[PDB]
Design a binder for this molecule. Structure first.
Ligand SMILES: *[C@@H]1O[C@H](CO)[C@@H](O[C@@H]2O[C@H](CO)[C@@H](O)[C@H](O)[C@H]2NC(C)=O)[C@H](O)[C@H]1NC(C)=O
Ligand SMILES: *[C@@H]1O[C@H](CO)[C@@H](O)[C@H](O)[C@H]1NC(C)=O
Lengths: 235, 51, 51, 51
């Protein structure tokens, strides 16, 4: 839809400090103002400046261009789940492949959920990705330090939620059933999954997945979901 | 298969030979399927686009 | 006449799924049925075939 | 209360699991390639006799 609590600040000066917050309300408020992305850019990407002025998290573009979860403002993105302490974000490893298809021209930061976790990819100050996104070329529009919200792309539609620990036997049975239901898949990003006595060329493959906080992911084809509210106090 | 760099034009022989022979190139799904491709967006000043 | 029962969440947009029929049915209401209102709930379903 | 359908629970093979994140995206993977290349074309040693 639109905003959740309020709009985005003006950010008149060059770089403003980021105070620490503890309550859920102020954290949701600063997430709605696209401050978490600025904090991530100031932690590992050393990017001076803020992005998404007066745009909020509602104007964030997506690759499929038809995101039904965008109408539900209550769902939390994986970046918000990492900001809330649910999961652990992984650094940008050069050995990881990024699924092509979107045009990275004019964009400054984009995240891609990998198979063994969640990684991010951004550029430094005054630079932006090209049409292919291989390098960070110079951009005159990125010199002001304020970038609109359309320059942030989220690869794939994924939402997170609090989970419950499960024993190892159930996880092992699920992994066995998944690897038995997909005999053609052999390796996923340099991770041994099945036994094929040989590796083939990389090829895209669309399939759903879920995480239970373990090392590798678990893909599933046939699944039945159910949405329950439960009237929890955390919401 | 024809290669061309965006903004510059046709590239020289070295990059196209490394794209066709080695296999660490970057192209469409057809090139990734018939010869292989590496799209890890590594550090590179330019890349000759093949299609 | 709306029969497109795909709210950007079903697995119909795949290459290995195949053919199917976008159907729907009705549900019950109450705390035991999953909602907080004594009214029928919209429950969608999708079937297909595999090999 | 925030506007959302709440937490989602998925069942697979009769077992109910509460995942952390739920989404559908693409991922690079490999396929199984069988290059038989005339494993057993034609080879046999026999003989004929008359009765
Ligand atoms: C990004 O950097 C900030 C700045 O250090 C990190 O904030 C710290 O978080 C730890 C964890 O609780 C606190 O003990 C420190 O006091 C914080 N420092 C501050 C607020 O200046 C932050 O954790 C880093 N990571 C993210 C995702 O923001
Ligand atoms: C933020 O604004 C204050 C206001 O005086 C000033 O220090 C400066 O413009 C900004 N701080 C920076 C860039 O560190």
């Amino acid at each position: 839809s639109g905003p959740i609590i309020c709009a985005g600040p003006i950010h008149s000066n060059k770089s403003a400090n980021i105070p620490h917050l503890l309550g859920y309300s102020e954290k949701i408020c600063q997430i709605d103002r696209l401050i978490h992305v600025s904090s991530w850019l100031r932690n590992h990407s050393q990017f001076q400046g803020y992005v998404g002025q007066r745009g909020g998290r509602s104007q964030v573009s997506y690759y499929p261009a038809e995101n039904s979860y965008s109408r539900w403002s209550g769902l939390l993105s994986p970046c918000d789940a990492d900001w809330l302490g649910m999961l652990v974000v992984k650094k940008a490893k050069g050995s990881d492949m990024i699924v092509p298809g979107p045009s990275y021209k004019g964009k400054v930061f984009f995240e891609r959920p990998t198979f063994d976790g969640y990684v991010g990819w951004g550029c430094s100050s005054g630079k932006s990705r090209t049409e292919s996104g291989e390098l960070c070329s110079s951009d005159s529009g990125t010199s002001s330090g304020l970038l609109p919200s359309d320059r942030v792309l989220w690869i794939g539609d994924v939402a997170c939620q609090p989970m419950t620990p499960i024993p190892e036997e159930t996880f092992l049975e699920l992994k066995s059933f998944s690897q038995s239901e997909f005999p053609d898949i052999c390796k996923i990003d340099g991770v041994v999954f099945n036994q094929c006595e040989g590796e083939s060329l990389p090829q895209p493959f669309d399939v759903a997945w879920m995480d239970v906080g373990h090392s590798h992911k678990i893909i599933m084809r046939e699944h039945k979901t159910k949405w329950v509210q439960e009237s929890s106090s955390k919401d | 298969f024809v290669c061309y760099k965006a903004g510059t034009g046709p590239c020289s022989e070295s990059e196209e030979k490394t794209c066709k022979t080695s296999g660490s190139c970057r192209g469409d799904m057809q090139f990734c399927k018939v010869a292989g491709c590496e799209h890890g967006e590594e550090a590179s000043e330019a890349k000759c686009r093949c299609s | 006449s709306t029969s497109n029962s795909f709210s950007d969440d079903w697995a119909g947009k795949m290459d290995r799924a195949g053919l199917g029929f976008s159907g729907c049915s009705d549900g019950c209401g109450g705390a035991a049925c999953g909602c907080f209102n004594a009214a029928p709930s919209c429950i969608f379903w999708r079937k297909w075939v595999e090999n | 209360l925030v506007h959302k359908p709440g937490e989602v629970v998925v069942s697979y093979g009769g077992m109910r699991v509460r995942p952390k994140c739920y989404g559908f995206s693409r991922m690079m993977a490999t396929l199984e390639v069988n290059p038989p290349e005339q494993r057993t074309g034609q080879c046999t040693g026999c003989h004929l006799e008359c009765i």
